[PDB]
Amino acid sequence: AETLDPLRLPLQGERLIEASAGTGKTFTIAALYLRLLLGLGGSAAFPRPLTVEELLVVTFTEAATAELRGRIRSNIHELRIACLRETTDNPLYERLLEEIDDKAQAAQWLLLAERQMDEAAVFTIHGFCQRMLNLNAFESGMLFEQQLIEDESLLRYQACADFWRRHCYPLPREIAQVVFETWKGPQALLRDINRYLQGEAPVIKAPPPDDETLASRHAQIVARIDTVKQQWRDAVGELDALIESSGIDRRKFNRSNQAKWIDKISAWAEEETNSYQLPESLEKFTPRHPLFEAIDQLLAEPLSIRDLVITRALAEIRETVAREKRRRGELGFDDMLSRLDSALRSESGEVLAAAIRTRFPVAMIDEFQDTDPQQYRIFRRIWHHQPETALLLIGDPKQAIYAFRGADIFTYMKARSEVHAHYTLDTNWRSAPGMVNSVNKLFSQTDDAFMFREIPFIPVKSAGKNQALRFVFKGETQPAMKMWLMEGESCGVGDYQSTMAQVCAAQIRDWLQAGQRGEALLMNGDDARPVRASDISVLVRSRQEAAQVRDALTLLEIPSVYLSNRDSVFETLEAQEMLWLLQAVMTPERENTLRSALATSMMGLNALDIETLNNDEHAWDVVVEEFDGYRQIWRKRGVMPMLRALMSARNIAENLLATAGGERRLTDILHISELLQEAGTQLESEHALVRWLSQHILEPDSNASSQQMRLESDKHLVQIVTIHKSKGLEYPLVWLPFITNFRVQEQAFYHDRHSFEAVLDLNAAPESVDLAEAERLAEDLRLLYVALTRSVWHCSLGVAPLVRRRGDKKGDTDVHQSALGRLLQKGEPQDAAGLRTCIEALCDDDIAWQTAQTGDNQPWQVNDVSTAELNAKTLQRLPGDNWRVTSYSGLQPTLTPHQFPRGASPGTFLHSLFEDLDFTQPVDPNWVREKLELGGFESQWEPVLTEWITAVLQAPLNETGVSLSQLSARNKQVEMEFYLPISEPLIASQLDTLIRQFDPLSAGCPPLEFMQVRGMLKGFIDLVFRHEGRYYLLAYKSNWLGEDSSAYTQQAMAAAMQAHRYDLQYQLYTLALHRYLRHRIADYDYEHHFGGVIYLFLRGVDKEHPQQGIYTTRPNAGLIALMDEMFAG
DNA sequence: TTTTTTTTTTTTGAGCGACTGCACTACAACGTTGTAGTGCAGTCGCTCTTTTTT
């Protein structure tokens, strides 16, 4: 490998950057981005400068892409300022300014990059794949709109259940017995094959033939057993082997156990006494007959139906899942990669790759250790060897810890074998040089510490600015790495975990007890800082040991937080308390639910309070009244107003904040309230939200929004964090109590050392088990390097002679089977004294060891402080007056028109029929039939309706007898919308008396009550028309449900006007028409131009009665001026 | 077409592998007897990671 300079890197072809842990990878990416933008490098530069929309940056994590986009924007702005000023304070910016000759063109290009920074092509992998699938949809064959699903486990379980239905149901008893012996149901099969159903389907080594079913394999194994049974029945009754001292004389009893075994071939499990009939075991305890060799050949391979069922499941479930996702039209995260790989797999899609070479002629791929083989196949299809396009794989093989997710280091090894150039970052800017020297000493004990040839380790160099970092104790300067070797010969798992958790808690309380007195310090040069509880962090791997650490730390009065806690908030007691409270609010009549909800910990009442509440009837009546008020608020205002009124009236938030340990409960209550308010807007019914809350209580599924948050941020807590959640973070002091605990992989799923393909071995071959255990040990070594390279000042290790084997004292320990002991014991099996000598061999100034001391003196000291006085400002007046833009409604034989259905929708249909129809032209029956087809009414009503319309049109509506046919198109105006202002507070008592002073219809009609309305009033007049130089108004009322006879005279219409209070509407219409004719027509008189207002009841118009149906009214011409003066001011 | 009423939970780990004790034969020392290796049976620890992508 070679060293990497960001200003001398040739951006041609494929380059492989190996950025170590703690190095400035994001700074090197920003430097290369500025280099690609400005076109710097000279001979090693790009042939042409590129824009922002041509630089493709690929990073997996979305927050990492957002941080990189913000950092690149800040670097662009800083370089633009430094180019406008021709000076800077950074040496890399100084060399960047020294590399360019021109300043004005570079400043203009940086200004255009700052303006085009919003359209930057810095996306994720799946986002880039979705964008390329949606952009060039023709060559790929992708839909334009698709629905991404977050959870795929439901369809996978459905396809597994369908496979178990179509495969395990028609089996006979002799096969279903073996199927039940292999798996209890489809859940066990799904639990077995869930690591192979997702992602790329692996290639099965030595697959069964396509014509072999379960019955053929069962008959083959039955015949194989029956041949051995026949050979035992033929050669029975003889004994010719020599009797040995190990061979007891009870073997004939084992032959009797083999005498009762040959009865039927309905079973599947042979006897263990056949292990006594092996020639390789009898020779070690002279076998000449081939019956023993046939028994050994029968027991050479396990008789199992498991591999054929697993192959049929892997052939069926994935196909059913793909068919279901093609039917529903949905897509997944890996489905975008599979669609892009299938598009590039075709012949025309290669030209599509050239389109990608037309789109972005560069690629900088960050985090190349988390690369699927489909992703690298795509990136090799696009950017293998084409000119003028560059590929920059910036990654780290020592951080590939996501093999459980789908990543694979063999893809990185294939990429390293394919590319030619390698570059590495030498400087480390995070940790102290003592920790750097400890890491370079521990991992360089032997050659190829990661046990693979393509993953080399290089000694990194510490920073010059961080060479004075010292974690000092009361005695002297504490060393960097302190391997706490637990003393003993052999120990178990739980006892070792408990002892190391107690030792870690004792070290935490010793660092915190001496840290609050100014003894233990972090010193940078001469500056010092006391060690708080947030500096010490325990790095664990599993949830059980994290709970063990938390229980061993909370015993010594030390609070600790769990950063890797992914538990749902709906699985706590507070969700059940909120459910009980909502059930008491919804049904407050039954006292049982209210009594069960009042006694919860959210209310916080004693047993004496509950007894006095059951005894006193008046207090329970007050409780029922306030819960009915809460139900009224919940039905009128929603969820969060009811919850806030409940938390303010009961004052339970102050009581939960006063109680120690109730702040997390209060934050959980607030998050449950926020989720209930978020789910309550999408539901109309009130019980539906309660059923949704009970379902989400019964469903412990984890979503990104429904997870538990951090309870507090100001108070420092000991942060327990897993190794996978600590990648890229930073911690001052790190404790690793369970770094020696290891787990042996049992399944045979490995990768070939030549083809680099996933090989799944269904047979229990030892070579596949060893090749899987080698990859497991490499993953454990990578996890060890990740957990080791996160400390800055001090790291502590827990070493112990852990034995995974069940024997207590066997003379050897299994530390060589772990990751730490492979570096301590140099990959050799030793003893506890050998482990101690290997620990004491590598003793430097940075690496020390001490024995594990079990002992506690005192938990802690609280040292609490008082809280200052604080108050809240109060608003003096009301926030606003009653300003609202409202309307009039806000201030308030077989076929006949009498038999018309009375409703709002038929009223609007008749209003639209009278609006759309022309009054001059005769009514056409086909137009009425088309309008009834568009509306959806009956077709039989059409020939009666049109003649009724003509009966309406033949009836004149005027004091002189003017019909509607005499009105031209310019004279009419339909649906005039007006806005009327009013600046005074509209008093109902001052208005109703002014109406009753002039209007004769206000003799009855007691006055309506409304608030003071100041602002605007909307109105929609139906028709305004002029005739012989006089303006007239026309409105339509068509409900008229209660009349079928000719009783709709002027008295009944006046009674309807007094009941529905249309007098105010007609008076406002006259005022609006008067103001309109005053504003429009100059020299306007109200008595000269206005003629009256006509109300047209549609169901009251008769052919013989011209007066019935119409209602003409004229004001007194004195109410209009007073109403205008009142509305004006 | 009308109408009657009711308050009680319960269950749930099992195969893998060692520890220990008894019994039975092989074999050598003193026909009979003591020690060792192996098999069978009851009892008990233990144990089942990590996470994020529009």
For residue A349, which of A94, A70, A33, A138 has the smallest C-alpha distance?
Answer: A138
Strand pairing class (A1015-1027; A791-799): unpaired
SS3 assignment, position A97: helix
Q: Residue A878 falls within a domain, yes or no?
A: no
- Structure-token pair, residue A819: 């990751």
Does residue A424 contact residue A1 with C-beta atoms inside 8 Å? yes
SS3 assignment, position A1008: coil
Instruction: Tell me the CA–C1' distance in angstroms for A738 and B49.
Output: 12
C-alpha dihedral, A64 to A68 to A74 to A79, nearest 10°? 160
Instruction: Tell me the CA–C1' distance in angstroms for A283 and B27.
Output: 20
Q: Residue A801 falls within a domain, yes or no?
A: yes
Number of helices and strands in chain A (H, E): 40, 27
Which one-letter DSSP state was computed for residue A566? -
Does residue A832 contact residue A489 with C-beta atoms inside 8 Å? yes
Distance CA A237, CA A252 (A): 10
Distance CA A116, CA A1095 (A): 63
Residue A86: Cβ within 10 Å count: 8
C-alpha radius of gyration, chain A, whole number: 43
Q: Report which residue type is found at A770.
A: D
Instruction: Tell me the CA–C1' distance in angstroms for A487 and B20.
Output: 28
Instruction: Tell me the CA–C1' distance in angstroms for A808 and B18.
Output: 9
- Structure-token pair, residue A503: 């030792």
Tell me the resolution in Å.
3.8
Instruction: Tell me the CA–C1' distance in angstroms for A97 and B7.
Output: 85
For residue A583, which of A698, A687, A676 has the smallest C-alpha distance?
Answer: A687
Strand pairing class (A972-982; A1015-1027): antiparallel
Residue where a domain terminates, one of A276, A298, A331 = A331
Which one-letter DSSP state was computed for residue A1007? P
Binning chain A into helix, strand and coil, the percentages to the nearest 5 are 45, 15, 40
For A207: left if phi > 0, alpha if psi spans -120 to 50, otherwise beta; the answer is beta
One-letter-per-residue 3-state SS of A279-317:
HHHHHHCCCCCHHHHHHHHHCCCCCCCHHHHHHHHHHHH
Q: What is the DSSP code string of A769-803?
A: HHHHHHHHHHHHHHHHHHHHTTEEEEEEEEE--B-
Handedness of CA A131, A137, A142, A146 (dihedral sign): positive
Q: Which nucleotide is nearest to A273 (CA to C1')?
A: B39
| Same-domain pairing of A278 and A373 | no
Count of alpha carbons within 13 Å of A909, Cβ hemisphere only? 17
Distance CA A66, CA A26 (A): 12
For residue A1002, which of A907, A942, A1078, A1066 has the smallest C-alpha distance?
Answer: A1066
For residue A961, which of A1094, A1077, A1099, A1114 has the smallest C-alpha distance?
Answer: A1094
Q: Which nucleotides of B are covered by protein (CB under 7 A)?
A: 17-19, 24-27, 37-40, 45-54
Residues paired with A14 in a beta bridge: A391
- Structure-token pair, residue A529: 């800082």
| Same-domain pairing of A236 and A112 | no
Q: What is the DSSP code string of A614-671?
A: HH-HHHHHHHHHHHHHHHHHHHHT-HHHHHHHHHHHS-HHHHHHHSTT-HHHHHHHHH
Does residue A781 contact residue A822 with C-beta atoms inside 8 Å? yes
Residues paired with A517 in a beta bridge: none
One-letter-per-residue 3-state SS of A501-523:
HHHHHHHHHHHHHHHCCCCCEEE
Distance CA A930, CA A805 (A): 88
The residue whose CA lies nearest the C1' of nucleotide B37 is A246
Q: What is the DSSP code string of A837-902?
A: HHHHHS--SSEEEEEPP---S-------------------S-S---B--B-TTTT---S-STTSPP
Instruction: Give, in order, the Cα–Cα distances in Å from A424 to each of A18, A431, A459.
Output: 5, 18, 11
| Same-domain pairing of A92 and A133 | yes
Which one-letter DSSP state was computed for residue A1009? -
Q: Report which residue type is found at A267.
A: A
Q: What is the DSSP code string of A7-52?
A: TS---SEEEEEE--TTS-HHHHHHHHHHHHHHT--GGGS-SS---G
Q: Residue A1127 falls within a domain, yes or no?
A: yes
**Could you identify the residue written with the tokens 């002992």?**
A855
Residue where a domain terminates, one of A710, A743, A767 = A710
The residue whose CA lies nearest the C1' of nucleotide B51 is A405
| Same-domain pairing of A496 and A609 | no
| Same-domain pairing of A818 and A895 | no
Distance CA A139, CA A136 (A): 6
Q: Which nucleotide is nearest to A807 (CA to C1')?
A: B18
CATH number of A1111's domain: 3.90.320.10
Which helix (H) or strand (E) segment holds residue A767: the answer is helix A766-788
Distance CA A603, CA A652 (A): 6
Instruction: Tell me the CA–C1' distance in angstroms for A542 and B50.
Output: 7
Which helix (H) or strand (E) segment holds residue A122: the answer is strand A122-123
Distance CA A417, CA A412 (A): 9
Distance CA A66, CA A70 (A): 6
Q: Residue A860 falls within a domain, yes or no?
A: no
| Same-domain pairing of A549 and A588 | no
Q: Which nucleotide is nearest to A495 (CA to C1')?
A: B45
For residue A640, which of A601, A607, A678, A602 has the smallest C-alpha distance?
Answer: A678
SS3 assignment, position A166: helix
* Residue A631 φ then ψ, to 5°: -65, -35
Domain that holds residue A415: 1-150+332-425
Instruction: Tell me the CA–C1' distance in angstroms for A228 and B43.
Output: 37
Distance CA A19, CA A16 (A): 10
Residue where a domain terminates, one of A853, A874, A904 = A853
Q: Residue A344 falls within a domain, yes or no?
A: yes
CATH number of A365's domain: 3.40.50.300
Centroid of chain to Cα A763? 39
For residue A817, which of A715, A919, A744, A746 has the smallest C-alpha distance?
Answer: A744
Instruction: Tell me the CA–C1' distance in angstroms for A810 and B34.
Output: 30
For A1029: left if phi > 0, alpha if psi spans -120 to 50, otherwise beta; the answer is left
Centroid of chain to Cα A44? 44
Residues paired with A17 in a beta bridge: A394, A423
Q: Which nucleotide is nearest to A493 (CA to C1')?
A: B46
* Residue A116 φ then ψ, to 5°: -95, 20
- Structure-token pair, residue A580: 């009980």
CB neighbours of A519 closer than 8 A, spacing ≥ 6?
A473, A474
- Structure-token pair, residue A881: 């007056």
Q: Report which residue type is found at A725.
A: K
Instruction: Tell me the CA–C1' distance in angstroms for A245 and B28.
Output: 13
SS3 assignment, position A1024: strand
Instruction: Tell me the CA–C1' distance in angstroms for A465 and B34.
Output: 80
Residues whose CB is below 7 A of strand B: A 60-63, 124, 126-127, 130, 148, 150, 243-246, 248-250, 254, 333, 404-405, 492-495, 541-544, 564, 566, 702, 704, 722, 724-725, 743, 805-809
**Exposed/middle/buried for A40, CB within 10 Å: 0-12, 13-18, 19+?**
buried
Q: Which nucleotide is nearest to A590 (CA to C1')?
A: B7
Residue A644: Cβ within 10 Å count: 14
SS3 assignment, position A1077: helix
Distance in Å from the first CA to the final CA of chain A: 89
Distance CA A974, CA A479 (A): 92
CB neighbours of A792 closer than 8 A, spacing ≥ 6?
A430, A431, A432, A435, A469, A730, A731, A732
- Structure-token pair, residue A1104: 């013989």
Q: Which nucleotide is nearest to A272 (CA to C1')?
A: B39
Q: Residue A927 falls within a domain, yes or no?
A: yes
Which helix (H) or strand (E) segment holds residue A391: the answer is strand A390-395
Q: Residue A863 falls within a domain, yes or no?
A: no
Q: What is the DSSP code string of A204-263?
A: ESSPPPTT--HHHHHHHHHHHHHHHHHHHHHT-S---SPPPSSS-TTHHHHHHHHHTT-S
CB neighbours of A624 closer than 8 A, spacing ≥ 6?
A588, A589, A594
| Same-domain pairing of A946 and A1034 | yes
Count of alpha carbons within 13 Å of A698, Cβ hemisphere only? 6
Residues paired with A330 in a beta bridge: A147
CATH number of A160's domain: 1.10.3170.10
CATH number of A613's domain: 1.10.486.10
The residue whose CA lies nearest the C1' of nucleotide B7 is A592
Which helix (H) or strand (E) segment holds residue A350: the answer is helix A349-359
| Same-domain pairing of A557 and A660 | no
Q: Which nucleotide is nearest to A148 (CA to C1')?
A: B54
Strand order in the sheet with A203-204: A203-204, A758-760, A749-751
| Same-domain pairing of A238 and A275 | yes
Does residue A363 contact residue A392 with C-beta atoms inside 8 Å? yes
| Same-domain pairing of A26 and A114 | yes
Q: Residue A867 falls within a domain, yes or no?
A: no
Q: What is the DSSP code string of A926-967?
A: HHHHHHHHHHT--STTHHHHHHHHHHHHHS--SSS---GGG-
CB neighbours of A1105 closer than 8 A, spacing ≥ 6?
A1046
Residues paired with A1031 in a beta bridge: A1026, A1090
- Structure-token pair, residue A997: 């002073």
Which one-letter DSSP state was computed for residue A832? H
Distance CA A128, CA A144 (A): 15
- Structure-token pair, residue A638: 């929603």
Q: What is the DSSP code string of A452-510?
A: -TT------B--STTTTEEEE-SSSBPPSEEEEE--SS-B-SHHHHHHHHHHHHHHHHH
Instruction: Tell me the CA–C1' distance in angstroms for A258 and B39.
Output: 17
Number of domains present in the structure of chain A: 5
Residue A909: Cβ within 10 Å count: 20
- Structure-token pair, residue A836: 């101690």
SS3 assignment, position A583: helix
| Same-domain pairing of A932 and A1079 | yes
| Same-domain pairing of A340 and A365 | yes
Does residue A792 contact residue A730 with C-beta atoms inside 8 Å? yes
